[PDB]
Amino acid sequence: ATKVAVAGASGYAGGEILRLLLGHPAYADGRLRIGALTAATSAGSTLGEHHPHLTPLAHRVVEPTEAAVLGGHDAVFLALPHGHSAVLAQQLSPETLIIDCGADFRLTDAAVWERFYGSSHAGSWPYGLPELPGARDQLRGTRRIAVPGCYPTAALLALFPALAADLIEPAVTVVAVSGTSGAGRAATTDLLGAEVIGSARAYNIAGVHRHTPEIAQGLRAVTDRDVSVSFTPVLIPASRGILATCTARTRSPLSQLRAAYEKAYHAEPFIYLMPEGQLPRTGAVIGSNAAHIAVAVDEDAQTFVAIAAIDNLVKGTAGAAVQSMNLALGWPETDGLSVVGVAP
Amino acid sequence: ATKVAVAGASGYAGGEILRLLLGHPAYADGRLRIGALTAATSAGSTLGEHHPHLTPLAHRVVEPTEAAVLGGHDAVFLALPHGHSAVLAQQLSPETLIIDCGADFRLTDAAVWERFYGSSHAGSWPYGLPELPGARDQLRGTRRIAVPGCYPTAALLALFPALAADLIEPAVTVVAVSGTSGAGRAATTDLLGAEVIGSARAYNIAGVHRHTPEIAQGLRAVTDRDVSVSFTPVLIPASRGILATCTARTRSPLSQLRAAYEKAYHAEPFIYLMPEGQLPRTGAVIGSNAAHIAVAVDEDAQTFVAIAAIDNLVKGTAGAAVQSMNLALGWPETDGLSVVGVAP
Amino acid sequence: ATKVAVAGASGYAGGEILRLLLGHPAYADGRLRIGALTAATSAGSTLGEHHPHLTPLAHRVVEPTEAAVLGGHDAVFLALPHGHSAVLAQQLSPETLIIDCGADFRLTDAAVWERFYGSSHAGSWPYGLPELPGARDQLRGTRRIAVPGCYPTAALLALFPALAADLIEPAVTVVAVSGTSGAGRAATTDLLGAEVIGSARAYNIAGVHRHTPEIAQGLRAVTDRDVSVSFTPVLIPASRGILATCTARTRSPLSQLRAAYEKAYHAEPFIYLMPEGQLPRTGAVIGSNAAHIAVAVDEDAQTFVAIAAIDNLVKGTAGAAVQSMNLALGWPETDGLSVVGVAP
Amino acid sequence: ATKVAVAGASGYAGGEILRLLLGHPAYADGRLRIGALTAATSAGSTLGEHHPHLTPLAHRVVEPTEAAVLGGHDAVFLALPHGHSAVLAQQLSPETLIIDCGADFRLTDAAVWERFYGSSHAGSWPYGLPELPGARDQLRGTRRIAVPGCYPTAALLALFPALAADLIEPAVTVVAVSGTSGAGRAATTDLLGAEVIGSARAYNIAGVHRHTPEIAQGLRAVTDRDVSVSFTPVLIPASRGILATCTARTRSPLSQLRAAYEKAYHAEPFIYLMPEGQLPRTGAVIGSNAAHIAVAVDEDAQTFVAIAAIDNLVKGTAGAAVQSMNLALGWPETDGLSVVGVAP
Ligand SMILES: NC(=O)c1ccc[n+]([C@@H]2O[C@H](COP(=O)([O-])OP(=O)(O)OC[C@H]3O[C@@H](n4cnc5c(N)ncnc54)[C@H](OP(=O)(O)O)[C@@H]3O)[C@@H](O)[C@H]2O)c1
Ligand SMILES: NC(=O)c1ccc[n+]([C@@H]2O[C@H](COP(=O)([O-])OP(=O)(O)OC[C@H]3O[C@@H](n4cnc5c(N)ncnc54)[C@H](OP(=O)(O)O)[C@@H]3O)[C@@H](O)[C@H]2O)c1
Ligand SMILES: NC(=O)c1ccc[n+]([C@@H]2O[C@H](COP(=O)([O-])OP(=O)(O)OC[C@H]3O[C@@H](n4cnc5c(N)ncnc54)[C@H](OP(=O)(O)O)[C@@H]3O)[C@@H](O)[C@H]2O)c1
Ligand SMILES: NC(=O)c1ccc[n+]([C@@H]2O[C@H](COP(=O)([O-])OP(=O)(O)OC[C@H]3O[C@@H](n4cnc5c(N)ncnc54)[C@H](OP(=O)(O)O)[C@@H]3O)[C@@H](O)[C@H]2O)c1
């Protein structure tokens, strides 16, 4: 049996990993066991005090996040803020499958990392976005996964097919709305319900958001040209969901762009291209590992437009982690990962 | 193979039955086929124009609700407004399993039906609330099921253990908040998003709500005493969820009340009694077939208080329908019905 | 010119006092000036860092909450958590008008205060609910005001006319839903947007909420029967608004109850009795100082039902404070207090 | 006295005009009277059945929308869907002040109008955006006003100072989120609460939205350069508010751009440039006629970023209508128009 530990089990990403594992077929038949659940200060509390939706695990006592407690598990999810997985990965048995939700091993340019995160670059692990060209093969049998950030997942799925086929200019604009669970459950006044309800605001604008270079990195993997990214995130009064509106200049006809998206995504089970006349909505993908995508051309503005909707906690985090865990373990990639949303 | 038709497939309850069937183990192993999907004016359209979250069924063409279309199915869900079940059930075989989400066959007193619904009584079918004393036995192998209303489900789960144990007075008060999907997807000005968002309102107050006699009927099934029900529903700015606050006068001690609930619900897989110090929240049960329940005693007011949270679309209707379907077909009662909520 | 200080200016109640003062006619004609704005940890920041909606005051620097800073003001609003007004009030001049939004001076029974607040009783000041029988006369020319809690404001307006006329039994039940701004802006995980959005929950149930004795106290002021209060508050996903559903057994006819509410409220400018066939909604009173009320009789359950909607930050706090301020200073009671809501 | 009629009084824009008129100083001192309130199918009903927040007018009976009904009024607000206004305005006296919230008289190019609205071009009236260069001159003493659309108001305020100073390129991108009251109150399934709540969706993308040429026309008024507009609107689960994220290739450093916005807006009472390190939020402007603006430069992407927040119903429509009314009547422009938002 694959014994699984979750570090950061009391946070939003850790809770969603547990939700997905509880529903995974390997948990049903005993090939996957849910072992130690650890955190920082929540140690000693029961899991139900943080995740009342996870009633089968509510009685579990949260433990300290120490190598000894996380030891003895074949797979370890790290659902912590960036800064801990580098040292934590080193203390663990190297045979252990380590799936890091944080950013520590995402970036391939050490100088880019130091500019945006202000610490020593730890390195890079296989990127947990299996639909990216080349990425799936690197995850088969791997023992190290860097799960993508939520906004990059939406932006890259929206944009890479057009850019890989040289059908748009490499200067892209991304304005993405997001529910507030993407910010984590650490209490701040700016994330308070009364503040968030009934309001929308852009934040970390004009290149300072740390996902900007992660989008750039993913796009550079499919083109020769110099990539620039204008990325604006906008917080909206929903708990989950990302709707990324992505634009770039183009002179290619719509029919060519449509065919490029059909070719890239016809055999990708989690990507759904909208029928003609329909557009994505975050409500349709909530609680699923799906991305819903539509493309169009603004002829007057000579601008390509791609819309992508994902659940930030599933395809944008925990579902990507479980998807990559499946590939790493040699299990069917779709195990435990529904494409069906929970709407309305 | 059990072939299933869903009448009212384009509505909220029909869409949620379909979501649950797609995840049901009998669908996965071919024991259950999803057959004809019918409606009224939406006949001729594709299901994706109504339920974009159900992408595996998006291509299905909605058919007319006609006995010729519903025939040849081993099971037929009726997810229609009340008024059509009697005729449709007359036209289907007695061996066909018919599961009615509407009210037509819920009430056992013709005079009560006439007073609250203004029409002749159709009769009554086994009530699809398996947790009620005596209900499960009536549902095993049955071919006719009347699924309960969503508010009675919450209220009856909150109250019947105390009342059946003679630990409270039979004059009960229920004030229940509900998300707006409980009203259905028919477009009215009062259900418009701009109206509902940011606002709460009680409606159909002081005994005019048709679920009042349904609550009373379920309580009279566990006591000979003179039941009265003060029921106030309150619409709140959520899409799903019912939180029923239920009260009754008592002089019994809390210890005896908690023991009554633990005895009644210990072996009930969908009922979760909150640990000491915790209270239910609708967010914890969304997308699950669970009910979360806590009880307390207000000594100064000599008042018993029971709180119950359910998802109105799952345990409040479509999950109850599939739960009853499982019992009717001799399948494991929990098949396809998770207790794990989709939160936050 | 009346110089006004606000202690706790960085909080929700303090911000709403300032919003109302900015729109008060005395502010427009110079009779009223907004002086010191004080807090605790927030001292040293600008007001716009806390209340970006108050742009005319955004540049104001928040000052420490000290007697020296607060001195030299004709009126001082205290918008602090309970337990600080006694120590702060005793350091101001007795001729200073002190208006306390907290509970410190609301309760008239020292033993009840100690039970529910766990500290020594400070005493009691004129209660800032002018519509209560006898209350308005105690406020005229006063220099001490204890502003009521938000739930008691709704429950008392819903219930006192029936109880004062001996038309209902004195055992009352109140189930009130509230937007999340009633909990204050101090950051807790339970108040985070992702948690409160899409979810509802009762809290502090079965008589432990500190507003239970405050409701009982107001009701005891209109009757000599023994009062008891079953009070359940319910957090819902809105930022503002309280909808109180209040019930009591009755043997009086509806016409008599209706007449008692018309008599009590016909001359009350902030109280609006719903037209026949209409019911209150919190969205209709947001941003106004109004209460919208309807009453009914559940004949089958021999139960009176009263529904009251207020804005918890206006008539439930800062509007009541400004309303009482007007009375204390001899200004027209409605000055700066609109009855028109901001909907949708 | 100025007698005012409102056509389309039962809708969202008409109701918000009435809210502002009720708080206008001319209404308080008798110089403005609220006369005929008209609609289509809601004629015969009372206004309270549509706008329960407008309790001082709740008793008013809605009348049919006929030119003879609207005659005899010194000022007429038209808050109807496109069409109607032209036919109605032709039958009204040329000495009547007509303020049209619809699009009929906004556009100055008949071929553009035909292409996006599919009807004959009625002409064009002075555009009701007083902050636009040259606009205030045209509004003084005018008897005809075309009020701008909500999204163009936000986009033009965000972009025109940069473009007028030739500091950015004329190919602009706008992605704007909007609360659902922008869609009007006509009941459709796509606007119902359960659909809108918890979901976000772009609509009318890639140049098909009718506000695209309106944005382009406003920008052409400040540059003789060729303007292109990529405009994407996104519906979010709020009832009010527009947050426009506007980008363009930059040819300038932030200091020059900030200075240009300071110069353009320091005089403007409704336009608030955010302090250093603060960004707009729609919650801060709800219920006010304010727009909050911030600008930035993404150096790595060489992209100018401008964020604008307004209330879609106030500065986006009814507030702009009343603002232009003041100017046309020779009244103080800010009369009845607060800059203070109703937050949280
Ligand atoms: N949330 C998303 O949508 C999303 C999407 C993509 C990627 N991610 C990434 O996933 C990671 C988790 O984010 P989140 O949203 O889940 O935040 P969160 O809800 O606040 O949870 C953070 C968890 O990490 C634990 N923790 C914090 N510091 C710790 C320390 N020194 N040692 C051990 N445990 C510690 C916390 O334990 P305590 O309870 O004791 O504090 C908590 O359980 C982040 O790195 C994020 O970048 C998140
Ligand atoms: N929604 C809940 O939370 C809930 C909970 C418990 C019980 N129920 C009960 O389940 C039933 C469905 O409620 P709902 O929320 O799903 O309403 P809904 O969303 O508005 O949809 C109703 C469905 O019934 C179809 N329909 C209406 N009239 C029909 C007719 N003459 N012939 C054939 N089909 C017709 C409609 O087809 P078209 O699309 O063509 O109109 C539609 O698909 C109700 O009786 C309700 O009491 C609902
Ligand atoms: N909010 C409502 O709906 C409502 C309704 C009715 C009555 N009330 C009552 O009004 C009062 C304020 O509630 P709230 O919702 O506004 O809470 P809040 O949003 O969290 O703000 C509390 C304010 O009090 C300040 N403060 C806290 N401790 C202080 C201390 N030792 N010394 C000086 N200032 C201190 C805080 O300043 P810092 O920012 O520096 O911490 C803050 O500005 C409460 O007593 C409440 O019971 C509230
Ligand atoms: N809503 C916004 O945020 C916004 C912002 C900027 C500009 N505008 C513009 O303002 C106008 C009103 O939009 P809205 O949001 O208020 O829509 P709405 O909420 O649906 O109301 C539309 C109003 O127009 C009336 N009406 C409809 N058809 C009519 C007809 N043949 N004859 C007479 N009256 C008719 C309606 O009366 P009945 O009740 O009888 O149907 C109703 O009162 C639109 O042109 C819009 O472009 C709106």
Residue numbers in the entry:
A (entry chain D), B (entry chain A), C (entry chain B), D (entry chain C): 9 to 352
Provide excerpts from the study:
The L-arginine biosynthesis pathway consists of eight enzymes that catalyse the conversion of L-glutamate to L-arginine, appears to be attractive target for anti-Tuberculosis (TB) drug discovery. The arginine biosynthesis pathway consists of eight different enzymes ([Fig fig1]) all considered to be essential for *M. tuberculosis* growth *in vitro*. In this work, the ligandability of four enzymes of the pathway ArgB, ArgC, ArgD and ArgF is explored using a fragment-based approach. In conclusion, using a fragment-based approach, we have discovered inhibitors that bind to novel sites in ArgB and ArgF and to the active sites of ArgC and ArgD, which in case of ArgB show on target activity against *M. tuberculosis*.
Binding of NAPD causes significant structural changes in two loops of the protein that move from a closed to open conformation ([Fig fig2]).
